[PDB]
Ligand binder design. Structure first.
Ligand SMILES: CCCCCCCCCCC(=O)OC[C@H]1O[C@H](O[C@@H]2[C@H](O)[C@@H](O)[C@H](O)[C@@H](O[C@H]3O[C@H](CO[C@H]4O[C@H](CO[C@H]5O[C@H](CO)[C@@H](O)[C@H](O)[C@@H]5O[C@H]5O[C@H](CO)[C@@H](O)[C@H](O)[C@@H]5O)[C@@H](O)[C@H](O)[C@@H]4O)[C@@H](O)[C@H](O)[C@@H]3O)[C@@H]2OP(=O)(O)OC[C@@H](COC(=O)CCCCCCCC[C@H](C)CC)OC(=O)CCCCCCCCCC)[C@@H](O)[C@@H](O)[C@@H]1O
Ligand SMILES: CCCCCCCCCCCCCCCCCC(=O)OC[C@H](COP(=O)([O-])OCC(O)COP(=O)([O-])OC[C@@H](COC(=O)CCCCCCCCCCCCCCCCC)OC(=O)CCCCCCCCCCCCCCCCC)OC(=O)CCCCCCCCCCCCCCCCC
Ligand SMILES: CCCCCCCCCCCCCCCCCC(=O)OC[C@H](COP(=O)([O-])OCC(O)COP(=O)([O-])OC[C@@H](COC(=O)CCCCCCCCCCCCCCCCC)OC(=O)CCCCCCCCCCCCCCCCC)OC(=O)CCCCCCCCCCCCCCCCC
Ligand SMILES: CCCCCCCCCCCCCCCC(=O)OC[C@H]1O[C@H](O[C@@H]2[C@H](O)[C@@H](O)[C@H](O)[C@@H](O[C@H]3O[C@H](CO)[C@@H](O)[C@H](O)[C@@H]3O)[C@@H]2OP(=O)(O)OC[C@@H](COC(=O)CCCCCCCC[C@H](C)CCCCCCCC)OC(=O)CCCCCCCCCCCCCCC)[C@@H](O)[C@@H](O)[C@@H]1O
Ligand SMILES: CCCCCCCCCCCCCCCC(=O)OC[C@H]1O[C@H](O[C@@H]2[C@H](O)[C@@H](O)[C@H](O)[C@@H](O[C@H]3O[C@H](CO)[C@@H](O)[C@H](O)[C@@H]3O)[C@@H]2OP(=O)(O)OC[C@@H](COC(=O)CCCCCCCC[C@H](C)CCCCCCCC)OC(=O)CCCCCCCCCCCCCCC)[C@@H](O)[C@@H](O)[C@@H]1O
Ligand code: HEC
Ligand code: HEC
Ligand SMILES: CCCCCCCCCCCCCCCC(=O)O
Ligand SMILES: CCCCCCCCCCCCC
Ligand code: FES
Ligand SMILES: [Ca+2]
Ligand SMILES: [Cu+2]
Ligand SMILES: [Cu+2]
Lengths: 152, 149, 139, 56, 73, 223, 115, 299
């Protein structure tokens, strides 16, 4: 995927893919891609903030450089119970979870603003390589998904 | 409750890649840069196009556009940059348009996804826009086919 | 009950006169010709008083003077059973709830809610009609 | 309460009641004691409506 | 309770202590007030919570005052 | 065509200046700029009847259109001439393409719809509620052109899927699934709205339990 | 009416929007004319009219009770437009056409007002 | 004083307004005279017929005065009959239309603003003739079987279009320029809903309807002349939606020579604001100003 493939106000689900994963033509390649698809913490939402709204973005400590300009990547797994929160409203910049109605402010580092969610969605650092393809700029700085007793 | 002074529909921005700007009395709409890309950067020396529409809020007098500057290169204005009394001034010819143009000679590399500051002066106000790069109706560039891994 | 229909015949004559006058006055020197909405309403407004008045005229000439139609009747003249009057019923509130359910379905255009409301109204109306006619359980 | 309203010669309006037990010499029924069982409230449920008639 | 208030007082459970309803109402209003603590950014809901809590507190206080003065039993 | 442009502006002046401005720059707190939205946005917003809007609320609802096909094209051309933008697909005769937009791979469209649309529009485009007064309307009434333009322009809260994020062939596959999932009859009886367990539980309580209790009354005795 | 009258005290919109004010006089008038004045006509009728004519009851006691509940639930349906996000009816109690058409009044508040 | 008895009625700038104002003052005087009599009778019996402390027997039980009753039904009939005659006289004068107006104005009302077009100008002295009819844009609206007499509800052919048109904006109040002392004809057509064409100084208004001919509405009214120059506000009176209170307009009255100069400027491609400045007039409306676009003070 490339940064110009997504317009302002658009959202797209992305998955962690490597060169060695292959195109799925080979039997071992299919199993590797199947594992990517069924990974419960794999899906990530890529949103492109409208440039006129970039002044309203509030950065989280330790995540000020996690965005490639106006492209932001947040985990698709809701922090409450693990449902995919993929109801992205482009104008209000709200991420709504269809399971228990949790709402996250995409401008304020996906901080929850409604529902039973109390923790913000993890942000994935992103960048581009020499060929211009969007790649991850590291790993999540916090665990992804529902919380547990041993978390943080 | 949702029909009060704070309304969700009324404050919505256009679903376009351009940027709105207020240059004192001139409304800058759909401000974006056209720059086809091949690699991670558009190298210096490449000529790109800056496209926008200037709207005259006032309806009594006229206005003229001068001195578009940016820290990405030099911007050249060709044509009659005067906006009429209550009309528009279309700078650039975007895709889907069946002649004022803004030609930018790059000094430092640019890439789609970031914001680059541009300065607009007409006669009564100088503002910064932070213009983005917008691919228009161009098709998705082909991706080389991955191997078996 | 000669006064009751005389009230309706008096209203009938005025409504008939107004309906005729309005139709003629709108046919001439009025843009668009006869104004149909008001003329139709006035003509059938006469019909409302005509049907009620005619029925009361037929009922009046059948039965003789009632105690409440007498100019010098005694209270003891009305002794006897008056008729059946329902002592209590919770069916009327169910009928309104049934009708309100259908109206809400029609307002939001939910055909399933409209169908439920119509079925509720029929069941609720059936209960009101059959309330004082159901026999004892048979076992 | 049978639902039938009767006008007395002096103008009183009274409703005919169906006693469920013994009555007084004046005609008013003797009050009965609650026994935890349902009590009839409609005359038609007590058989006052009769039967329409045997046949198809 | 007496049979004059509840006719079938001897046929089943017919009395609930007034202290249970009074304390429950006060805990009812307190739970509404603590729910303003949350992630919601609007305050329309907060005023609704305040109004309902105030109504519940007023009802509990009126009942307690009337029972204390002896106007109701 | 100069005839189409002046007709569109003439229609625009008495219907779209109060909220969008005379020069399409937008009226603050009343309406956004129409520069660069393109003919596709105008086609969707007018043919679906969403525009002209009547008031400010959580979400502008759909209603009967205020213009016919010829006036929609004129309005689209006028807005298109101001800023450019995406255009509605057209067939050989120049009319708005409807049948040619139906893709041939409905299985691919189903997976794409479930990845990209099901979240807001439900498993079978029945609609879904959004945050505060907003909602994803049922998709059973939109023609293929309207679905294509909605995916292109991203109206209100729907993401503006570009031709690079979703290729024309992918969009045609999605509208094929949208059009077929709405025209496919239910196989196990009445569909009950297709909303899942919620109508199913309501139907049980109001039909089966009512019948079961009603039958119990008939067999059983009172008191 | 207190909300409107407070808003009209000073020029400029202090706390109400145009839409909310439009909904206010529509519903204010609907409630006063159809939900207060018309029913209380029958309010005084059930109080004294059988007494005034020396009657023991109305002609149809169950139909009389049906009117009250039809009136209470019908009024609640129209008022229930205020809980919708769009709001209640805003075209005035006169409901002049074609302002009440689905093109110009697409909200569900107007439909609840009609039903 | 006539101003006190007018109860806020503007003086008027047209002879029809003057005649209407004269009828209003006389009717108010008649109404006040009747009200004073009835209020005095109510106050008289309330102050002098109260129960005293030295009365034991009930008052005289009279409840029928036939001669008084018959008299009290004729006097109100006479007053309304007199008022009806003057009412009929005034409305005939106000609704009278001359077959040869000097200025014809096309008034187009829409949600939520105004558009003013100059259909035809024909001065009675022959010093100015102009035909502003634009039939090549009226035939472009036709939409066509059709649900209504072969036409779809989007026909819009009932509207009128002109070469010189003043179009209203959200940040620019539309100003209509008219000559003083000339007969003006107003043709009212509404695009969408019903609006209201009210100039308070005209002391007259008429509703602006879509498809006025199909609704049997006479959408044309004339004023004999405007007796003074200046600027007068105009407001919408018919509930037309969200911005029913924010679509005011202004009527600017200038001298015949000034009006001719203004029309020439408009014919020369000048906008309404600069053409007004060309005749030494304020470019914007002075009686009213555009409303702030913000939905309120809390935004
Ligand atoms: C009585 C109940 C009332 C409550 C009070 C009593 C309990 C309160 C007392 C304590 C207590 O709760 O104990 C019970 C629990 O015990 C065991 O939990 C302990 C501990 O608590 C957990 O927090 C901890 O997380 C567990 O380590 C796992 O993660 C470790 C890492 O994590 C740390 O980092 C996390 C996130 O960050 C990092 O994330 C990733 C980690 O790599 C990487 O991405 C990355 O490195 C990142 O780091 C960054 O850091 C910096 C950034 O700035 C920079 O450097 C870099 O940038 C870098 O990137 C945080 O989120 C975490 O919080 C944490 O800080 C790994 O290191 C480990 O390898 C492993 O994976 C750990 O487990 P351990 O060590 O394996 O075992 C020990 C032993 C438990 O000791 C006890 O005291 C037991 C007795 C007391 C409890 C009751 C039992 C006895 C009573 C009787 C039996 C009754 C009759 O085990 C056991 O016997 C457990 C047996 C089962 C229970 C039986 C109950 C009885 C059964 C019947 C009922 C687990 O079993 C839990 O399931 C269990 O609940
Ligand atoms: C779109 C969704 C719609 C949802 C609804 C649809 C649900 C379908 C389920 C249908 C229910 C089937 C149960 C009926 C059993 C048949 C009994 C029979 O043969 O009649 C003898 C039976 C009396 O026998 P009994 O037990 O000896 O009588 C003792 C007393 O006399 C009893 O007298 P009582 O004084 O105790 O009270 C009498 C009571 C008896 O009525 C009932 O008890 C039936 C009400 C059912 C509700 C049960 C749960 C209540 C919870 C609320 O009647 C009423 O007061 C109201 C009943 C009005 C008739 C309903 C009209 C049907 C129109 C539907 C449209 O009379 C009935 O109950 C007849 C009811 C008629 C039902 C019509 C069948 C519907 C078929 C359509 C299917 C689709
Ligand atoms: C609708 C309004 C119709 C009722 C107005 C008539 C007033 C006459 C007063 C009277 O006798 O009251 C009877 C009685 C009043 O109670 P009460 O004070 O105890 O009267 C004792 C009588 O002295 C003793 O009288 P009774 O116990 O012998 O019962 C008399 C009753 C006995 O009549 C019968 O034998 C059965 C008639 C019941 C009405 C059927 C309703 C049909 C609904 C269809 C829905 C689907 C469409 O006869 C009538 O009420 C004559 C009316 C003839 C039926 C015409 C209705 C057709 C509706 C047209 C739909 C459009 O009420 C009724 O039985 C009928 C009124 C129920 C009205 C339902 C309201 C909902 C309607 C909305 C439908 C829209 C669906 C969507
Ligand atoms: C006596 C009995 C009943 C009496 C009640 C009748 C009178 C009540 C009076 C209420 C006032 C009416 C005003 C209506 C108009 C209105 O509302 O327009 C105001 C604007 O406000 C919001 O903008 C705020 C700003 O203007 C913006 O500048 C700002 O930006 C924005 O900030 C948010 O938004 C930003 C985004 O921009 C974010 O950045 C930011 O972070 C934040 O989120 C602001 O928003 P926010 O704080 O949400 O405030 C919203 C409204 C809030 O509404 C409301 O009235 C809520 C309704 C409450 C009603 C109470 C319920 C009663 C229940 C029943 C009666 C119980 C049953 C009884 C039982 C039976 C009886 C047995 C005895 O505030 C107010 O009006 C003030 C509230 C004061 C009311 C006091 C009443 C309390 C109850 C007391 C009762 C005591 C009783 C005791 C008895 C003894 C937006 O909505 C705007 O569009 C809107 O335009
Ligand atoms: C003893 C007891 C035992 C008996 C129990 C059995 C009872 C069941 C009886 C019924 C069985 C019917 C079998 C046939 C099945 C069938 O062949 O099915 C046809 C098709 O039909 C629907 O297609 C519609 C169109 O044809 C499509 O063109 C259109 O596209 C589609 O639209 C959907 O799709 C669009 C995108 O495509 C979306 O845009 C859109 O929004 C929507 O989703 C449409 O569907 P829709 O609008 O759903 O309804 C339309 C319904 C209208 O509703 C209804 O049936 C409502 C009524 C039933 C529904 C269930 C009850 C609801 C209960 C609620 C709880 C009510 C709430 C109350 C609240 C109170 C409590 C709360 C606290 O019209 C009809 O069928 C008319 C038929 C009416 C027949 C009535 C039966 C008569 C019985 C008489 C018995 C006499 C016996 C006497 C003996 C003596 C869809 O289903 C299709 O899939 C389906 O294929
Ligand atoms: C005020 C009541 C409006 C009128 C009258 C018209 N429009 Fe509008 N429009 C309005 C708003 C508040 C919005 C934004 C939110 C929404 O409901 O979509 C819009 C949106 C549009 C768009 C979409 C813009 C985008 O970003 O792509 C278009 C193309 C549009 N409006 C066109 C349009 C036309 C042609 C109108 C005259 C028929 C018209 N609008 C009237 C507010 C209002
Ligand atoms: C939630 C964030 C959405 C996602 C993801 C998708 N859609 Fe959507 N859609 C959404 C809304 C809120 C609306 C209404 C907008 C309006 O301006 O009123 C829509 C609208 C449509 C429509 C138009 C439907 C009509 O009324 O007939 C269509 C055809 C549609 N949406 C289709 C669609 C598809 C195919 C999507 C996957 C790419 C999709 N939507 C995503 C909300 C959301
Ligand atoms: C008593 C109800 C008063 C309602 C006032 C608020 C009006 C706007 C609500 C909608 O939106
Ligand atoms: C120049 C303005 C003078 C104010 C006139 C006020 C008239 C008051 C009339 C009161 C009538 C009450 C019935
Ligand atoms: S799963 Fe996202 S809200 Fe509970
Ligand atoms: Ca104010
Ligand atoms: Cu208007
Ligand atoms: Cu108006």
């Amino acid at each position: 995927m490339r940064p110009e493939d997504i317009d302002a106000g658009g959202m797209e689900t992305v998955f962690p893919w490597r060169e060695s994963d292959g195109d799925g033509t080979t039997v071992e390649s299919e199993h590797k891609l199947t594992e990517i698809a069924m990974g419960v913490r794999n899906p990530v939402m890529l949103i492109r903030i409208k440039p006129a709204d970039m002044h309203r973005v509030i950065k989280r400590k330790g995540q000020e450089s996690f965005n490639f300009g106006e492209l932001f990547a947040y985990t698709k797994v809701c922090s409450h119970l693990g449902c995919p929160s993929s109801l992205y409203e482009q104008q209000t910049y709200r991420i709504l979870c269809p399971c228990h109605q949790s709402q996250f402010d995409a401008l304020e580092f996906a901080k929850p603003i409604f529902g039973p969610a109390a923790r913000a969605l993890a942000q994935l650092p992103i960048t581009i390589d020499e060929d211009g393809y969007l790649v991850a700029n590291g790993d999540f700085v916090e665990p992804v998904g529902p919380a547990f007793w041993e978390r943080k | 409750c949702s029909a009060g002074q704070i309304s969700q529909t009324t404050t919505q921005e256009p679903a376009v890649n351009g940027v709105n700007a207020q240059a004192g009395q001139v409304s800058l709409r759909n401000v974006h840069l056209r720059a086809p890309q091949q690699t991670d950067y558009v190298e210096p020396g490449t000529t790109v196009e800056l496209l926008f529409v200037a709207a005259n809020d006032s309806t009594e007098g006229s206005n003229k556009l001068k001195s578009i500057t940016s820290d990405v290169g030099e911007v050249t204005l060709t044509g009659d940059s005067t906006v009429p009394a209550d009309g528009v001034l279309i700078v650039g010819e975007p895709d889907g348009q069946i002649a004022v143009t803004a030609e930018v000679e790059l000094t430092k590399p640019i890439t789609n996804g970031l914001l680059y500051d541009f300065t607009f002066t007409f006669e009564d106000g100088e503002t910064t826009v932070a213009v983005p790069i917008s691919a228009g109706e161009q098709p998705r560039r082909p991706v080389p086919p991955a191997g078996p891994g | 009950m000669h006064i009751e229909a005389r009230l309706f015949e008096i209203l009938t004559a005025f409504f008939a006169l107004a309906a005729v006058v309005y139709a003629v006055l709108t046919a001439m020197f009025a843009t668009g010709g006869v104004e149909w909405a008001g003329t139709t309403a006035l003509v059938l407004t006469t019909g409302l008083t005509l049907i009620t008045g005619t029925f009361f005229r037929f009922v009046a000439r059948r039965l003789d003077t009632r105690p409440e139609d007498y100019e010098d009747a005694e209270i003891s003249d009305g002794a006897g059973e008056l008729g059946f009057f329902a002592p209590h019923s919770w069916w009327p509130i169910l009928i309104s709830l049934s009708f309100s359910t259908a109206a809400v379905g029609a307002a939001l255009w939910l055909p399933w809610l409209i169908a439920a409301g119509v079925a509720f109204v029929i069941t609720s109306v059936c209960g009101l009609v059959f309330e004082y006619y159901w026999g004892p359980e048979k076992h | 309460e049978t639902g039938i309203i009767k006008r007395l010669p002096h103008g009183a309006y009274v409703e005919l009641h169906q006693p469920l037990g013994p009555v007084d010499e004046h005609g008013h029924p003797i009050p009965l004691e609650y026994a935890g069982a349902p009590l009839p409230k409609r005359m038609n449920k007590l058989g006052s409506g009769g039967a329409p008639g045997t046949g198809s | 309770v007496d049979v004059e208030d509840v006719p079938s007082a001897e046929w089943g459970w017919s009395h609930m202590p007034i202290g249970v309803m009074h304390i429950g109402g006060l805990l009812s209003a307190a739970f509404l007030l603590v729910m303003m603590r949350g992630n919601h950014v609007g305050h329309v809901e907060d005023w609704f919570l305040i109004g309902f809590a105030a109504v519940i507190v007023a009802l509990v206080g009126r009942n307690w005052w009337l029972r204390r003065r002896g106007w109701i039993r | 065509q100069s005839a189409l442009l002046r007709t569109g502006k003439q229609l625009f002046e008495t219907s779209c200046v109060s909220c969008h401005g005379a020069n399409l720059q937008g009226v603050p707190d009343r309406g956004p700029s129409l520069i660069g939205t393109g003919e596709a946005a105008v086609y969707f917003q007018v043919s679906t009847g969403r525009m002209p809007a009547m008031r400010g609320e959580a979400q502008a609802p759909s209603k009967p259109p205020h213009f016919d096909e010829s006036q929609i094209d004129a309005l689209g051309a006028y807005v298109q001439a101001n800023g450019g933008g995406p255009t509605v697909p057209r067939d050989d005769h120049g009319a708005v393409a409807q049948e040619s937009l139906i893709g041939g791979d409905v299985a691919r469209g189903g997976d794409l719809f479930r990845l990209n649309c099901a979240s807001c529009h439900n498993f079978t485009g029945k609609g879904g509620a959004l945050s505060s007064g907003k909602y994803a309307p049922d998709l059973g009434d939109a023609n293929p052109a309207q679905i294509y333009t909605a995916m292109l322009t991203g109206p209100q809260n729907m993401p503006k899927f570009s031709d690079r994020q979703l290729t024309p062939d992918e969009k045609r596959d999605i509208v094929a699934y949208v059009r077929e999932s709405a025209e496919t009859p239910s196989y196990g009886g009445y569909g009950l709205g297709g909303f899942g367990p919620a109508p199913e539980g309501m139907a049980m309580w109001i039909i089966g339990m009512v019948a079961a209790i009603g039958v119990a009354m008939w067999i059983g005795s009172r008191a | 009416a207190l909300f409107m009258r407070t808003e009209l005290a000073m020029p400029g919109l202090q706390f109400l929007s145009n839409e909310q004010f439009n909904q206010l006089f529509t519903m204010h008038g609907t409630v006063m004319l159809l939900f207060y004045a018309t029913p209380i006509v029958f309010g005084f009728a059930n109080l004294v009219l059988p007494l005034q004519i020396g009657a023991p009851d109305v002609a149809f006691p169950r139909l009389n009770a049906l009117s009250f509940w039809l009136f209470l639930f019908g009024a609640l349906i129209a008022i229930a437009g205020f809980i919708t996000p769009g709001g209640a009816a805003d075209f005035g109690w006169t409901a002049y056409s074609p302002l009440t058409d689905a093109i110009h009044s697409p909200g569900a508040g107007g439909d609840l007002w009609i039903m | 004083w006539s101003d006190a008895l007018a109860l806020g009625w503007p003086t008027g700038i047209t002879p029809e307004a003057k005649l209407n104002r004269e009828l209003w003052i006389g009717s108010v005087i008649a109404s006040f005279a009747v009200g004073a009599i009835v209020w005095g009778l109510i106050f008289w019996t309330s102050a002098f017929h109260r129960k005293k402390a030295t009365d034991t027997e009930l008052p005289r039980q009279f409840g029928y005065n036939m001669p008084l009753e018959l008299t009290l039904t004729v006097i109100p009939f006479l007053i309304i009959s007199v008022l009806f005659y003057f009412t009929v006289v005034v409305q005939e004068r106000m609704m009278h239309k001359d077959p040869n107006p000097e200025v014809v104005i096309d008034v187009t009302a829409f949600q939520w603003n105004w558009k003013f077009g100059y259909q035809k100008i024909a001065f009675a002295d022959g010093s100015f003739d102009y035909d502003g009819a634009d039939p090549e844009r009226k035939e472009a609206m036709t939409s066509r079987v059709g649900p209504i007499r072969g036409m779809t509800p989007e026909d819009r052919t009932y509207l009128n279009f002109d070469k010189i048109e003043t179009l209203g904006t959200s940040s620019e109040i539309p100003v209509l320029v008219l000559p003083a002392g000339k007969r003006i004809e107003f043709v009212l057509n509404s695009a969408d809903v019903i609006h209201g064409f009210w100039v308070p100084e005209f002391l007259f208004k008429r509703d602006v309807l879509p498809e006025p001919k199909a609704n049997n509405s006479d959408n044309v009214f004339q004023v004999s002349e405007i007796q003074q120059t200046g600027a007068f506000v105009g407001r919408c009176t018919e509930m037309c939606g969200t911005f029913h209170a924010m679509m005011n307009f202004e009527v600017r009255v200038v001298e015949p020579n000034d009006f001719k100069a203004y029309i020439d400027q408009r014919n020369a491609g000048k906008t309404n604001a600069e053409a007004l400045a060309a005749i030494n007039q304020p470019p914007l409306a002075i009686t009213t100003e555009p409303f702030e676009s913000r939905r309120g003070e809390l935004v």
